[PDB]
């Protein structure tokens, strides 16, 4: 065997808001499972996707300070040939960042 590979992905969310107003952009995916109990029967769910929550504010010089909460997740896939691809195992990998920049 002799293998080469290359992959590029560029994603970009855009959001518009006002001064001192919290805004949310969200692009998620929900996975519903059937927990067959008897009493507290429930539809349990997981959620993963791109998400921004920002709180912009103008400084005295004209710079923009922001309070960020960034999440970027996707669905990691195990081997499809084995039995664990038909049950409720979506191995989720996320990436969380929480900071303040100006």
């Amino acid at each position: 065997l002799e293998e080469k590979k290359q992959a590029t992905v560029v994603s970009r969310p855009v959001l518009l808001t006002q001064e001192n107003v919290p805004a949310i952009f969200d692009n998620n995916r929900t996975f519903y499972t059937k927990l067959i109990g008897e009493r507290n029967v429930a539809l349990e769910h997981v959620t993963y996707g791109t998400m921004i929550r920002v709180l912009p504010r103008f400084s005295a010089d004209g710079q923009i300070e922001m309070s960020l909460d960034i999440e970027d997740g996707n669905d990691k896939t195990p081997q499809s040939d084995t039995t664990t691809s038909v049950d409720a195992l979506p191995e989720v990998g996320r990436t969380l960042i929480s900071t303040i920049a100006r």
């Binding site: 001064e19 001192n20 504010r57 400084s59 920049a101 100006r102």
Partner: protein, 46 residues
């Protein structure tokens, strides 16, 4: 008056404080706020 009748309420819609008191207690909190309000520096950690 006393120090116990000063009311301070956050107003986040314009990012400002609301102080209610006498004419000498309002000037007393305004001099404290200008000492706690400084610009910060950025650190990048690798």
């Amino acid at each position: 008056a006393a120090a116990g009748n000063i009311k301070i309420v956050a107003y986040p819609d314009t990012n400002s404080l609301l102080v209610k008191g006498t004419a000498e207690q309002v000037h007393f909190i305004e001099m404290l706020v200008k000492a706690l309000d400084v610009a910060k520096r950025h650190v990048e950690l690798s």
